[PDB]
Ligand binder design. Structure first.
Ligand code: MG
Ligand code: MG
Ligand code: MG
Ligand code: MG
Ligand code: MG
Ligand code: MG
Ligand code: MG
Ligand code: MG
Ligand code: MG
Ligand code: MG
Ligand code: MG
Ligand code: MG
Ligand code: MG
Ligand code: MG
Ligand code: MG
Ligand code: MG
Ligand code: MG
Ligand code: MG
Ligand code: MG
Ligand code: MG
Lengths: 51, 96, 213, 148, 202
RNA sequence: UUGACCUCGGAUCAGGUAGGAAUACCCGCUGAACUUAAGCAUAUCAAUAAGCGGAGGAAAAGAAACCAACAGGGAUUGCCCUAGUAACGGCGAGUGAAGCGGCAACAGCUCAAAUUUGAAAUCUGGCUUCGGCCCGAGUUGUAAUUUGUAGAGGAAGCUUU
RNA sequence: AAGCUCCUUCGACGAGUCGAGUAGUUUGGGAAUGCUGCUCAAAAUGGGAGGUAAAUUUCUUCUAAAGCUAAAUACCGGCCA
RNA sequence: AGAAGACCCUGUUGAGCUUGACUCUAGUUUGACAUUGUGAAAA
């Protein structure tokens, strides 16, 4: 049937908690390498390029 | 309003505003033309059979029986009471 | 077929409900189309605001009378006091409600000043720009910095009166003489016994006292 | 998720967890609350006392807005004062001011005297008040304003 | 105006004058036919207040229907259901006899639009009604904004769908609290109360 | 004898219109039983399926003989909530709304009931189309004013196309 | 020809309808929510409603028995994506 | 071998038929009101 629960209601606050964790995890060199990115020549993990 | 939650005149105190009512509330007011036309038709038409029975009862001074008969024909106590007074007036007009 | 310490079910699913199941998969699609309709209406209505001015009304029950909201339209008493003809207000973005009645001067006064405030900020272009009339806004007064929606600027500002007032100890209000609890108990008893006291006033003995001189 | 289920665990075993004797039939016992007085009586008398019968009088057009009167216990009176203002009164900074709350602005009608109050005088505007709520307000030096 | 006088007279249906006219006209309508054209309205006031004008395009018909309730058109008393449905005699039709006369006239003159209708007489076995119809193809009707709304296709056979005054009464289209089940349509309201609405996020 | 009027007819008279299809959604009428109640008859399934009539791109409803009891809201429709609640029910199984509140949308109007009465000022049809003319309808009332929010008659002032 | 302020004068407002009884059906609507059949059958500050039947006295809110009107809503049957 | 015994029993499974089983019903009979009006005679 098309009555099946296709969409999931996630609490706003667990979405924001996870988004902050994802941003924090983006600032760790081991977590970039363990994912599979080629960051061997990146000076600092929060790579900020002048706008 | 007394400004209290309970009591006789309970309610928040406010300044009442006095204004003439809506014109739609003026319904039920007998205009002079309507009363004139209804008098002409009343003479031409006459009386319903049940009205004539009540007037006979009223003339014999059987007021309770006249009201009971008027109630059964009309349906309600209020309409019967109003009709009996109306019939009592037309009796008076006929006998000057 | 109850088996354990359950809550007794209340599932009204015995009437072939599967034929009348409405699933809202077009919630996102309807929202996008509503915004497209709103944009088209605004473009056609420019430079007029997309909505109409509405009065402040008080909610009609003891549960909600503490709060005010927006009404349907301005009553004829409010419009007449503000100095706007009844059949001119709809042409300038004002909502008219002939059914509503004003029983208090306070609510009437609050809506009249709102009508005058809107009238002050309103610019009316001439029916033909070549020859402006008395009631048309002059060319210099027109500026071009207009507003999109009236209800954003003319919404409710304080729907519920604040409860954070602070007063000097000198201005401390006095107490109820018999006690506020007793004031409520006495008020309830008066309403409960209003008919009994009136019946005995007016008593058969009082009528007998009236009869017996 | 279907992979976390006994159904995936019963694949291979005949009865699928329902027994060889006394198998899983359609409706052995009734459909719904059937037999609440006859054969499901031992369940209703045990877990749902008061189910059968009729108690009280009727109310034909009950509007629940008439019965609207949210309560507020005086142990939470000072929580309606803003944080910056509540500090000076509670801390003991005796002064010439006294707060006025006007409960109805916060969505309350009656005031009940459960907790305790600091001896700071305070003015409250309430629709209803209880005997003890008034008594504990008076002792603190407060004032009760009955409003509508 | 003379129309105010006759309206007041028409309320005196028990008077000698009105009773005589009702009796004589009842005899005349029995002889004529069941559905037949009427040259002019027999009650000019009632026709006028219902929307009748004296010009081309407005047509009056007199219709006749049989009084009494409805008998179930089953075989010889046999209803093969439960005891609660074994009723043949005292049943009643959910529409009014006025609508039945209104609808039969519409079928015969299926090129006019029924405007409204009104009771004109009755006897033991019949009730007599007059039906006001409008011809939407007449140039005198298409040119009058007060009536040319009926030319639109949504107004075809409004007597069959219940969009006339007598039909709106039968449906229960009134604003009060006594019409809760039928204000917006009885079947529309039932379908709304019984729909199980499931949103994307539950 | 002739000419009217009323009613009822004829015509392959001049000009038109209806039917049938479709019916997913919509407006009505009619109308079950299987099933649940661990039996069954009220109930339930269901004011549903089948049957019949009628429209549209939507339909229907719709500008209160409304809701309320308040410091009052103010046409209709739809969503969320009210609420599995008030209530109904072999008071069993079961069924079951509405006011208020937040929002989407927003729009108001036309008649009858008045004497143009110092002027039927109104309209179909034919011819002419060049302005108009000629039959007919209509005074048992077609135009203009008025619809309760009012309005009409006043007499001063301002203002509108 | 249209408005606006003013107060005196008026101020037509829908009948086999409203309402009542009874029968059937329907409803959450329970001394009866709606509809329909039959019998009776109104009035002018009258009438209806104010969720317990009735009598008495007040109060509140609307103005039935004539009509039109777009949007928000339904629907994948038809056409196209 | 052919056929989920057709005899028997169980099922809160049926159907055909019967009757003074329980509950109804077409039809019919009787009464009331309407259709339904106009006179005369007594009591
Ligand atoms: Mg095992
Ligand atoms: Mg097994
Ligand atoms: Mg088992
Ligand atoms: Mg066993
Ligand atoms: Mg069963
Ligand atoms: Mg069973
Ligand atoms: Mg069985
Ligand atoms: Mg069907
Ligand atoms: Mg429509
Ligand atoms: Mg809840
Ligand atoms: Mg049901
Ligand atoms: Mg009954
Ligand atoms: Mg039925
Ligand atoms: Mg009933
Ligand atoms: Mg309509
Ligand atoms: Mg063998
Ligand atoms: Mg076997
Ligand atoms: Mg057994
Ligand atoms: Mg059997
Ligand atoms: Mg017997």
């Amino acid at each position: 049937k098309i009555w099946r629960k296709w969409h999931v209601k996630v609490n706003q606050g667990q979405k924001r908690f996870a988004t902050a964790s994802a941003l924090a995890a983006s600032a760790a060199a081991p977590l970039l390498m363990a994912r599979g990115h080629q960051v061997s020549t990146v000076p600092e993990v929060p790579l900020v390029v002048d706008s | 309003k007394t400004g209290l939650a309970v009591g006789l005149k309970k309610g928040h105190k406010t300044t009442a505003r006095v204004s003439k009512p809506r014109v739609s509330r003026t319904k039920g007011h007998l205009s002079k033309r309507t009363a004139f036309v209804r008098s002409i038709v009343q003479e031409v038409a006459g009386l319903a059979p049940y009205e004539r029975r009540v007037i006979e009862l009223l003339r014999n001074s059987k007021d309770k029986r006249a009201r009971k008969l008027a109630k059964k024909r009309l349906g309600t106590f209020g309409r019967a009471k109003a009709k009996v007074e109306d019939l009592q007036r037309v009796i008076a007009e006929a006998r000057r | 077929a109850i088996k354990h310490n359950q809550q007794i079910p209340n599932n009204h699913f015995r009437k072939d409900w599967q034929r009348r199941v409405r699933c809202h998969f077009d919630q996102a699609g309807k929202k996008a189309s509503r915004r497209v309709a709103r944009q088209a209406k605004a473009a056609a209505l420019a430079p007029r605001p997309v909505d109409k001015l509405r009065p402040i009304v008080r909610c009609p029950t003891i549960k909600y009378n503490r709060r005010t909201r927006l009404g349907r339209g301005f009553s004829l008493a409010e419009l007449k006091a503000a100095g706007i003809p009844k059949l001119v207000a709809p042409t300038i973005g004002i909502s008219v409600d002939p059914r509503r009645a004003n029983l208090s001067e306070e609510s009437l006064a609050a809506n009249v000043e709102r009508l005058k405030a809107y009238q002050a900020r309103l610019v009316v272009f001439p029916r033909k720009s070549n020859k402006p009339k008395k009631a048309d806004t002059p060319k210099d007064q027109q500026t071009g910095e207009f507003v999109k929606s009236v209800e954003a600027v003319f919404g409710v500002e304080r729907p519920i009166a604040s409860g954070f007032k602070e007063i000097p100890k000198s201005e401390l209000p006095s107490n109820i003489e018999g006690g506020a609890f007793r004031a409520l108990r006495k008020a309830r008893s008066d309403a409960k016994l209003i008919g009994v006291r009136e019946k005995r006033a007016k008593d058969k003995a009082a009528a007998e006292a009236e009869k017996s001189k | 998720p279907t992979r976390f289920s006994k159904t995936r665990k019963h694949r291979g075993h005949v009865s699928a967890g329902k027994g060889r004797v006394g198998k899983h039939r359609k409706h052995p016992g009734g459909r719904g609350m059937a037999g609440g007085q006859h054969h499901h009586r031992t369940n209703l008398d045990k877990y749902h006392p008061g189910y059968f019968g009729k108690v009280g009088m009727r109310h034909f057009h009950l509007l629940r807005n008439h019965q609207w009167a949210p309560i507020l216990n005086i142990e939470k009176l000072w929580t309606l004062v803003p944080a910056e203002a509540r500090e000076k009164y509670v801390s003991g900074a005796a002064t010439e001011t006294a707060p006025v709350i006007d409960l109805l602005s916060h969505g309350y009608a009656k005031l009940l005297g459960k907790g305790r109050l600091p001896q700071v005088p305070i003015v409250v505007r309430a629709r209803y008040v209880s005997a003890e709520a008034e008594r504990k307000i008076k002792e603190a030096g407060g004032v009760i304003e009955l409003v509508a | 105006g003379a129309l105010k006088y006759l309206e007041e007279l028409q309320k005196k249906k028990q008077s000698d004058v009105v009773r005589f006219l009702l009796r004589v006209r009842c005899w005349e309508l029995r002889q004529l036919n069941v559905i037949h054209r009427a040259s002019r309205p027999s009650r000019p006031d009632k026709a006028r207040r219902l929307g009748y004008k004296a010009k081309q395009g407005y047509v009056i018909y007199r219709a006749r229907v049989r009084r009494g309730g409805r008998k179930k058109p089953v075989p010889k008393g046999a209803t093969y259901g439960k005891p609660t449905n074994q009723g043949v005699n005292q049943l009643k039709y959910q529409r009014s006899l006025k609508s039945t006369a209104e609808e039969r006239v519409g079928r015969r003159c299926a090129n006019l639009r029924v405007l409204n209708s009104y009771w004109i007489n009755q006897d033991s076995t019949y009730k007599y009604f007059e039906v006001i119809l409008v011809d939407p193809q007449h140039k005198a009707i298409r040119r009058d904004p007060r009536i040319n709304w009926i030319v639109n296709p949504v107004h075809k056979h409004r007597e069959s769908r219940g969009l006339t005054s007598t039909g709106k009464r039968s449906r229960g289209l009134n604003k009060g609290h006594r019409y809760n089940k039928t204000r917006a349509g009885r079947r529309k309201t039932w379908k709304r109360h019984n729909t199980l609405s499931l949103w994307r996020y539950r």
